[PDB]
Amino acid sequence: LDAFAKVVAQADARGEFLSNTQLDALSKMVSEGNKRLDVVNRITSNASAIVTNAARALFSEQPQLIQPGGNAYTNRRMAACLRDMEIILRYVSYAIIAGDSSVLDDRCLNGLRETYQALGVPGASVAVGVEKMKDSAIAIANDPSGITTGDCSALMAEVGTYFDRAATAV
Amino acid sequence: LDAFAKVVAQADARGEFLSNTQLDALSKMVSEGNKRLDVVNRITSNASAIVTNAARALFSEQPQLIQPGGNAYTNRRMAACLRDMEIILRYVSYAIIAGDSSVLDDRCLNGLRETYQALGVPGASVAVGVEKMKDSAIAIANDPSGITTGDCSALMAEVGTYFDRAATAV
Amino acid sequence: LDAFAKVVAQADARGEFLSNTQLDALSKMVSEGNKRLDVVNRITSNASAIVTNAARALFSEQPQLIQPGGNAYTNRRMAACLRDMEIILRYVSYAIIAGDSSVLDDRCLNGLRETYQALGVPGASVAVGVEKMKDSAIAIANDPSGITTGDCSALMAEVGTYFDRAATAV
Amino acid sequence: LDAFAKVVAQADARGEFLSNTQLDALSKMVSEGNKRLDVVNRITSNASAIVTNAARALFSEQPQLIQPGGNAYTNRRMAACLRDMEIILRYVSYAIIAGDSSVLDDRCLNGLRETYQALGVPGASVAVGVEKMKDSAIAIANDPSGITTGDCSALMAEVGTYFDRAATAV
Amino acid sequence: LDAFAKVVAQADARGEFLSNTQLDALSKMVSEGNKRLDVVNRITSNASAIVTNAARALFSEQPQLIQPGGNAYTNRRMAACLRDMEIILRYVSYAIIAGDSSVLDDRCLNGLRETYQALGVPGASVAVGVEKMKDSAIAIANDPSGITTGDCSALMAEVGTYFDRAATAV
Amino acid sequence: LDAFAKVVAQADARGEFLSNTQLDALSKMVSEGNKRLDVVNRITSNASAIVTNAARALFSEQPQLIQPGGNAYTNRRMAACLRDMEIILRYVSYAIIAGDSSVLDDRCLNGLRETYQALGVPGASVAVGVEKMKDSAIAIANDPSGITTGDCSALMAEVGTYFDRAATAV
Amino acid sequence: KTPITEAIAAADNQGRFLSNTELQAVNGRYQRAAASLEAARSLTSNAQRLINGAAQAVYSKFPYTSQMPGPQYASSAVGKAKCARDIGYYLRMVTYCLVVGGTGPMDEYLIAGLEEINRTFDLSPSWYVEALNYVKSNHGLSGQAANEANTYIDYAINA
Amino acid sequence: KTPITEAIAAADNQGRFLSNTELQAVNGRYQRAAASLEAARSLTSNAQRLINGAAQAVYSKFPYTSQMPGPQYASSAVGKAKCARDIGYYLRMVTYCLVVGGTGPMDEYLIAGLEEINRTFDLSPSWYVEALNYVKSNHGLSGQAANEANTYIDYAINA
Amino acid sequence: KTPITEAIAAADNQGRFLSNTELQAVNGRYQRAAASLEAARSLTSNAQRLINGAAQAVYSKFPYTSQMPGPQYASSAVGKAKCARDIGYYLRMVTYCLVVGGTGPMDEYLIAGLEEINRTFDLSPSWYVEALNYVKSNHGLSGQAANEANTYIDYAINA
Amino acid sequence: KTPITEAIAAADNQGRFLSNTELQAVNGRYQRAAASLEAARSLTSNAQRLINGAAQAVYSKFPYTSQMPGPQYASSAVGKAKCARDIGYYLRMVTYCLVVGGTGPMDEYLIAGLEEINRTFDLSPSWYVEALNYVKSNHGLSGQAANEANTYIDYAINA
Amino acid sequence: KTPITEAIAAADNQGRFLSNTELQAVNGRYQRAAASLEAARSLTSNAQRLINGAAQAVYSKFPYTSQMPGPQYASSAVGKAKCARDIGYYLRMVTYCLVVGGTGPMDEYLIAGLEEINRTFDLSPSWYVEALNYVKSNHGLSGQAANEANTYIDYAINA
Amino acid sequence: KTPITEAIAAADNQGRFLSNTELQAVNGRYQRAAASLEAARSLTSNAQRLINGAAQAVYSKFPYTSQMPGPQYASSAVGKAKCARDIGYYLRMVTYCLVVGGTGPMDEYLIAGLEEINRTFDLSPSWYVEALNYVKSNHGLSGQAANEANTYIDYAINA
Numbered sequence A, B, C, D, E, F: 001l002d003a004f005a006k007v008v009a010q011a012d013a014r015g016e017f018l019s020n021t022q023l024d025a026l027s028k029m030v031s032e033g034n035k036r037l038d039v040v041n042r043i044t045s046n047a048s049a050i051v052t053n054a055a056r057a058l059f060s061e062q063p064q065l066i067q068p069g070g071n072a073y074t075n076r077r078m079a080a081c082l083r084d085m086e087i088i089l090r091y092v093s094y095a096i097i098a099g100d101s102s103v104l105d106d107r108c109l110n111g112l113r114e115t116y117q118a119l120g121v122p123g124a125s126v127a128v129g130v131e132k133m134k135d136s137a138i139a140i141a142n143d144p145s146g147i148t149t150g151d152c153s154a155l156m157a158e159v160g161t162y163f164d165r166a167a168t169a170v
Numbered sequence G, H, I, J, K, L: 001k002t003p004i005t006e007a008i009a010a011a012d013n014q015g016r017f018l019s020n021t022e023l024q025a026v027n028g029r030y031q032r033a034a035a036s037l038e039a040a041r042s043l044t045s046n047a048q049r050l051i052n053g054a055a056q057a058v059y060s061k062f063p064y065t066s067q068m069p070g071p072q073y074a075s076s077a078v079g080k081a082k083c084a085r086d087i088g089y090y091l092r093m094v095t096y097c098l099v100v101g102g103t104g105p106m107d108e109y110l111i112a113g114l115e116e117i118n119r120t121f122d123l124s125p126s127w128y129v130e131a132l133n134y135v136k137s138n139h140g141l142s143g144q145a146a147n148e149a150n151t152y153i154d155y156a157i158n159a
């Protein structure tokens, strides 16, 4: 689902047409569309540096992850770890264009806590990684430079929720 | 297994030849063969109307199934529902030609309660559907018109057991 | 893992080079190499008779296994049973050439107790089968005839452990 | 390829940037975009009737196709035949949105003459079917009713070429 | 196709009901049914000896097939060769129960000459093998002992044709 | 086949034991074994530079390959091209350890001329690439530095033949 | 599909020779031939009457098919000729089934693609169901020959 | 399916982030929102009139549906209520499509299994085709809002 | 495998109800029951004589089996008891086949894994082939009951 | 990949005609054409300056590339000509992307096999990242034309 | 299969060049060549004596093979010639294995299809097992050359 | 991967026991142990000197790595410590390979994911290639122990 499809799916379960008030709310989502595309474009256009700088900060904070015996030690494990950061940011970015977290829940987060528990991947350290990507992604999305000035506070709050949802899930 | 293979399988587990009494019982199953084929032929030749009329009666009795939000609401769900009624009657009909419920247990009913519980399909409403197909199937199989007159009571009881077995299983 | 790879894997987890003492121990494994190859060659060259004579002794001791109703009754079940004895000896023989039980644990024994419990295969009777193969395999491996005389006691103890590990696992 | 990608692919083979004249031509394709979408929308929105009325006219003209022994006799053959008409119109419609015939050549027409020759499908009768869909599709696309008035002659010529290309190919 | 389905398929191509004369001919095939089942049963019940004795006679006649360098030399090649004799007799036996050679043509013989030419299998020696199976199969099918006496000449001629068809095909 | 298996396969086709003279020749192959392993080790240990330097020299000689419109222009085509050079050297190296070209013929060269003709890959330019790898591989294999001095002329001739075989095949 | 081709297919799918299991199946096919052939012979002799009778019953059950404008309807001479043709196809397929002891001829020539055709040409399944019911009600067969004919008629109705 | 979910699906099927190729697709979805929402708002305000009007047009085009005995027909109060309910389902699905910029809602809730339902319950596609044509002829929309509404109506007709 | 399970399997593999094609197969199974049951009843009444008779015929055809050292041979009381047991298993499987109208019981209980067993325990197929031939030569059945018994005996010989 | 080919691919992967869902995607492609074409026209007019400027910025950021011995370096006239050629390839691919509304041209002609090439020829990704950053910093575009150009430049940087 | 082809196969299955892991395997093949070639040379020089000796040992262990009627037996001049031929095939395969350092020649030329042949022609595995045991007992080899010869002989016995 | 695990894997992939073909491979592994262990012992004793020496050679070959700003460079105390750590990882992996007679330890712990890491963190393969060349030039080994050490060093260079 995207945010429009969610409203529809709730209405179909009640057997109802959408009210004018609900059509107004959908109109409003369209008015926020250019801002939302900027958000997706900005995060996506910086995805490599977002992942890499967050991972670097994580390993800097938690040197035991990369020390021999650590879960991110060896190049195969480090590569898995970088790919997880990329995958999570990738699904978060889908949630932002959708205005709905179902794609992130259904295709990424569902069962992931269990996955990590079974592999011995430290879910809590993943959460730290995701929160640093959150902070960088928002600072980038909400950069007042090189864009028409306006207020994106509602969106930045919404972006926040997806990253927090992921960090909670892991 | 069919009913003959069941007797064999029990005998093989004891390492025994079948007794004359058991061969007599198998002979008797053969004498009931034409009646059993009539039963299968009659139920099968009316399968579409059996399924459709039972589903119609079910939805008539339980309008909430088809109301928006209901488990059989939407054409994809209704289609799944009709296919389940058809599948159950199909496996019941196999059990009747076999004179044994193993095909119905092994290939249809085993795990189905669980399946419905996981999907949120109302197993109890399925049971009602199966019981209405039972009533129609027997009334059709046991129609005194257009057939050589004789007593099919034992068979109609046996047919009953397969439909009841299914209704219990769901 | 083989025994050399195990030492390496433990050292890599600590981030360490192997000490001279550990290189000496690895040297010693190489000095025992010709004896170990004799052990593998002797057990393997007699694998059919090892399996067959152990199974024969098992069925002789436990006639209920082969009596009608028994788990090894019927040629399909007997064949499954012989194949299990062969598979276990096959994986034990891999463990002997490796000087490490990981291949036997990973590819054979892991989950096997569960497998038998689900099928109703009597795990304890399997264990008896494995112990008779142990006794024959060691008597064959440790035959003083037709080989350069020397002491293989350490190896025969080690071979013992793999067979016992299997018997415990089932 | 679409028409824009074709220009690019020709330029890449010469190692060249597009000239202002070529960028002007691409601009012009964009100015024709709303008209082209109307064409696709109109043909697509009438696809069932386009296929069905053309097939009906074909079978009317060539009754031997549907007579016993005919290539479109039997419901399985008739169904194959209707599906071929639908597939061809489907790929023609892709070519129209693309402003390029490569999708129609690559995924539909390439090898089709051979296919029909091997099956004994009368390629020439297919061609007649395709030409009747052409005539209906253009009359529908170019209907002056219910649309902003303007000149679509260039487009209708281009649509023509795709249908003719298909009819030639079969 | 079986022989009944062939008559139907020819009639469907003309759009015709079967004439009384054609229904009479089909009746006659049914009257020959018990004899035909004896033929299938007798050939099938002796299939192993039919294949084996024919192969033995072939290798006896053509010792170069089994000499080193010969196409049936090595146990893998000999096994392939025996399997080909079995496969051919198997498909011939299907043709006999069907009263039609389409199954033998479609699933066995079509493309086999080519197959052998590509592998260097001597098709002509295969033909000799098939002809010896023909001679044994007919002598067995047409054995006057242990069966109700009557005339099977028409059938033995028909059986002949299937074996000859195979021998020609290879 | 390796060179030993080839001698065996020729002997098996004649049904013969190997003569003492043939066993002597096989002994001689074993005496050349350490030299052959050096050859394989040296070529393999330098494989990346062998491929890369040959490709560089090829593109230097034939700048049209890399110019826009050239068969090795674009990074996807260049990558395919480098992979072909690597694959050919890889199979040549297998032929050297085997002392037989069958692996190179069977798994690499068979059908490759056709492959290139169908793709429009310039087989002749491939041949030039392969010949430069030949020259580098032999100069590396036959380097008098860092090895026990002796005569590898026979081997270098044999290595030559495999590279030439590939260049001819493309 | 006939009992004979099915027997072969069952053997061939397992790469094995025909066993008694399949020979007994073919025996059953011969045993039911008398009834199947009684039905096939009667339906065939009576084909013209049954076809034209069924077509007329359909128009009387659904009079709109005689009057509604559209090529899918028997509201033209062409339409009527199509309708009688179609019903003749169904009756002919029933006889073919009888003759081979199985549904094969109907399956291959008629049922495969049936739903797609009816949908595409806007033909109502109910029109053919009534034709089939007319045939069943009017063939005049009795005993096991009626059982046989009705089994295949009902097979088509289910389709 | 909406242009947004399709954009995601196209990116996800290749394991890649959204590119400009997909962002431009979503831009198109926003650009057509004005027309789609004009249609959705009008069809919704006029729902009662369009539904009951369409139902009456269907009975007048096919008067037999008012008289023929059988549960598939509007020849009972129950039947009429089912028919008006159904047409309301179609109109509601059209509005949902408009609102999301795609066929998804109709696809999932209505078209999947449609053929099976109509066949099973002996409902004629032509009855719903006429209802759909009535809606198209009677919504009263113009300009690109009519284009939008008619695209989805015609989508259902094709189904 | 019985004609009944095969009929079901053929229907189920195609996801369809049983058709006449399968009902006629089951009819054939009932029609051959008289012969199959005549054979099963006779072979069963005569089981002891046929088993011990066959075992003795095998030792006389292959006297080395009475004298050669090894557990695979009837050169011990244990060996003889195994041999008579085995032949009893074959005869019992023949009766089971007769009773169900098919090879299923022999297939499942005896033929699957047969080659592997004989190879592993060094039992010669020829010993059992002679036992089977003794049964065939000595059951004393006639008419179609002999046909039935011999079909399954020959089935085992082929195996 | 262009928004148009993606729309087709989405329809074709499901065996269906184009729906409104895909037509709206193509509308978005036309709506962004003005910006994309403003960028393509400017980058193209300024190609020589941007290419030679970027090449010089790379050598100044990484002076060792002007001096280190090896064919991978711009420490020869050949090397310098390769470097300027390469940067010209990147700029040309950006214009192609702009022209088609998608990453397709860069994907097919440049990104596929990029990692393998850089690794094999010992070319450092950082050299091209700096060239790309120079182009971004120096194209002089503003408004949505800069957004468009920078989206594709950043796409290459990510690659 | 030889240690060399296996080394190649292991590299090729992973699409990689030969590594030291495989070169060391081939070194082992050369190191055992002295023993393998001592055995091959001795078995070959002594082939006639070992073959005819083994054949005679088999007939004396199984005297029935000299007297029982049937083509599977050495109870004819043809049979005896087949038996000696066969044993010669086994001995020749042992020498081939020795020469290549692996089971490949026996696997390909003899073991593949062995079970099927013995079963079909009613040849008893025990006859060849005794021939193989005679060769082992009578080759007269010692040291690692005996180990080598016996490894392959025992390989055949296991088969 | 070691010659022993490869031997097992080759047997297990075919579901068979180890044959002489695999035992001879393991013999080769033991035969090369003397050389491999000479190299492992020397490289290990000299680890500190070789690691710190290699790190210094890399900075002198690529002086920009001592001065360029960025976390990928040895232009900080942290960077230098990472670089020496990394080179120590390579040398340690070489010793592990020597000890097991195969590339397994390097493959699993270092080469898998290597390209992805270098790309992501902007580390240049050339820096590690020079470290590896320094080790090769400076280990001081001779004879087959040098061959062994250099085989694995060159394996890493190729990677």
Ligand SMILES: C=CC1=C(C)/C(=C/c2[nH]c(/C=C3N=C(/C=C4\NC(=O)C(C)=C4C=C)C(C)=C\3CCC(=O)O)c(CCC(=O)O)c2C)NC1=O
Residues within 6 Å of the ligand: E031, E032, E033, E034, E035, E036, E037, E038, E039, E041, E141, E142, E143, E144, E147, E148, E149, E150, E151, E152, G022, G023, G024, G025, G026, G027, I032, I143, I144, I147
């Ligand atoms: C599916 C299992 C099945 C089998 C196996 C089967 C055989 C079968 N064959 C039979 C007859 C017969 N079988 C033969 C056949 C021959 N007569 C000969 O002298 C020669 C050489 C042949 C060679 C085929 C003849 C002539 C009859 C009597 C005529 C007839 O019944 O058609 C009969 C009639 C009863 C009888 O006469 O014994 C049966 C039931 N029926 C079955 O349903």
